[PDB]
Design a protein around this ligand. Structure first.
Ligand SMILES: *[C@@H]1O[C@H](CO[C@@H]2O[C@@H](C)[C@@H](O)[C@@H](O)[C@@H]2O)[C@@H](O[C@@H]2O[C@H](CO)[C@@H](O)[C@H](O)[C@H]2NC(C)=O)[C@H](O)[C@H]1NC(C)=O
Ligand SMILES: *[C@H]1O[C@H](CO)[C@@H](O)[C@H](O)[C@@H]1O
Ligand SMILES: *[C@H]1O[C@H](CO)[C@@H](O)[C@H](O)[C@@H]1O
Ligand SMILES: [Cl-]
Ligand SMILES: [Cl-]
Ligand SMILES: [Cl-]
Ligand SMILES: [Cl-]
Ligand SMILES: [Cl-]
Ligand SMILES: [Cl-]
Ligand SMILES: [Cl-]
Ligand SMILES: [Cl-]
Ligand SMILES: [Cl-]
Ligand SMILES: [Cl-]
Ligand SMILES: [Cl-]
Ligand SMILES: [Cl-]
Ligand SMILES: [Cl-]
Length: 244
């Protein structure tokens, strides 16, 4: 009756990923015995001085537990004089649901428009870290300062450059898996603008009644990514009169 066991090593919290079991390890000294209690029941290594012990916990054990309360294991060590108890280690079922609640939709937009891409990722445990892809490459709001990630996992293109014409994809990840949304095509068009009217051609008669022409062109700018053609006359022709 001198001491009480000290845990050199304690069972650590852990996740069931798919149907793969979890090992818990614990080691203490000094100890005449050491053993796992899960949810108040003793459990031996079978289908479940310094001394150590290990166990496995299985998907089935965690599912079949009565109650909403997290499954837990702790170790108990024995000396000549008493017991010590390890921390409680929590084993949780990890998952990432298959379907996105909300995926982004394709858009046409004018140059300099604000674009909002909606994404509501599948639910996960652990909770799902959301990214966005621009033509594969991962966007990053720090560097790419024309982009904001909303706390709702949405993407904002602040004002649309023309290089922002791309395929955009919401990705959700955790330790279980990664899931890609439906890829949304964003297209940034420029509508056409007229040049200035060229100068009137000289009056076909230097003194008397004649005619002259002028023109302009859908080039200021030319339409782009299927923006609108210019609207109105490209060409004019009227009578003129110079006097002598
Ligand atoms: C958006 O989608 C299509 C297809 O996507 C990618 O193509 C490769 C570049 C590859 O890296 C994968 O990520 C995808 O498969 C893009 O590809 C071309 O364009 C047309 C679109 O009408 C497509 O249907 C053709 O198959 C593709 N042709 C060739 C020779 O690659 C498309 O360009 C993307 N849109 C934008 C705005 O970038
Ligand atoms: C050319 O025509 C008129 C301007 O005169 C507008 O419809 C538009 O600016 C277009 O580029
Ligand atoms: C051509 O026509 C008149 C000027 O003559 C303006 O409306 C504008 O300059 C356009 O390019
Ligand atoms: Cl201890
Ligand atoms: Cl452990
Ligand atoms: Cl207990
Ligand atoms: Cl047992
Ligand atoms: Cl041992
Ligand atoms: Cl599951
Ligand atoms: Cl899965
Ligand atoms: Cl959207
Ligand atoms: Cl940017
Ligand atoms: Cl641009
Ligand atoms: Cl995956
Ligand atoms: Cl997926
Ligand atoms: Cl435009």
């Amino acid at each position: 009756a001198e001491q009480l066991p000290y845990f050199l090593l304690e069972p650590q919290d852990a996740y069931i990923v798919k149907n793969k079991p979890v090992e818990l390890h614990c080691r203490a000294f000094p100890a005449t015995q050491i053993y796992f209690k899960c949810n108040g029941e003793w459990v031996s290594q079978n289908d479940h001085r310094v001394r150590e012990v290990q166990i496995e916990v299985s998907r089935q054990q965690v599912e079949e537990l009565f109650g909403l309360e997290d499954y837990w294991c702790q170790c108990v060590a024995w000396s000549s004089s008493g017991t010590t108890k390890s921390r409680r280690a929590y084993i949780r079922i990890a998952y990432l649901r298959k379907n996105f609640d909300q995926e982004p939709l394709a858009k046409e937009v004018p140059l300099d428009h604000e674009v909002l891409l909606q994404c509501r990722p599948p639910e996960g445990v652990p909770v799902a870290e959301v990214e966005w892809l621009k033509n594969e490459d991962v966007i990053d709001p720090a560097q790419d300062t024309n982009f904001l990630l909303t706390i709702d996992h949405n993407l904002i293109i602040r004002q649309a450059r023309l290089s922002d014409t791309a395929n955009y994809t919401c990705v959700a990840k955790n330790i279980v898996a990664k899931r890609r949304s439906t890829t949304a095509t964003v297209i940034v068009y420029v509508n056409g603008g007229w040049s200035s009217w060229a100068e009137w051609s000289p009056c076909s008669n230097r003194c008397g009644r004649g005619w002259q022409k002028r023109t302009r062109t859908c080039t200021n700018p030319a339409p782009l990514n299927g923006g609108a053609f210019c609207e109105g006359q490209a060409f004019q022709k009227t009578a003129c009169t110079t006097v002598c």
